[PDB]
Amino acid sequence: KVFGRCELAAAMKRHGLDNYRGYSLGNWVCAAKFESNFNTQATNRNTDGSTDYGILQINSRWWCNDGRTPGSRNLCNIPCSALLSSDITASVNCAKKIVSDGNGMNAWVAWRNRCKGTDVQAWIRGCRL
Ligand code: NA
């Protein structure tokens, strides 16, 4: 599924991501934009052989099991395929653990490079939330 901007804002809000660990909803929508362009089926191979999955490009190195990332962990206790669902519940639950891991949203390098410090409220502007 390819979400619209306000449609994803609503789904993230419904799943309790808005102001989770102090990150306003526009931060989460901005990260999703640059990670996946709002596409739940987005996958990208890393140089180290891990893969990033879903709307928030969660990495098999630590967070999910894809059976092909040697030496990796599965800290969200999910198959990486669950992160590709049209239902964002697994991506949200796992993103809450990532953002709680100590470096906040800096875990998403695209959030640090493209969202951090910007007018992230623009991402939810005009949305009925
Ligand atoms: Na893994």
Torsion angle defined by CA atoms of residues 63, 33, 18 and 129, in that order, rounded to the nearest 10 degrees: -140
- By what method was this entry solved? X-ray
Three-class SS of 22-42: CECHHHHHHHHHHHHCCECCC
Residue 7 annotated to the active site: no
- Contact present, 83 and 92 (Cβ < 8 Å): no
Q: How many angstroms is it from 54 CA to the middle of ligand 1?
A: 15
Q: How far is the CA of 72 from the centre of ligand 1 (A)?
A: 4
18 is in an annotated binding site: no
Q: Which residues contact 103 (CB under 8 A, 6 or more apart)?
A: none
Q: What structural domains does the chain harbor? A: 1-129 (1.10.530.10)
Give the span between the Cα atoms of 51 and 129, in whole angstroms: 32
CB 51 within 8 A of CB 14: no
- Ligand 1 centre and the CA of 52: distance in Å? 10
* Angstrom resolution of this structure: 1.6
C-alpha distance from residue 101 to each of 33, 52, 97, 127 (Å): 22, 18, 6, 30
Catalytic pick among 7, 35, 48, 66: 35
Paired tokens of 5 = 């901007």
DSSP for residue 58: E
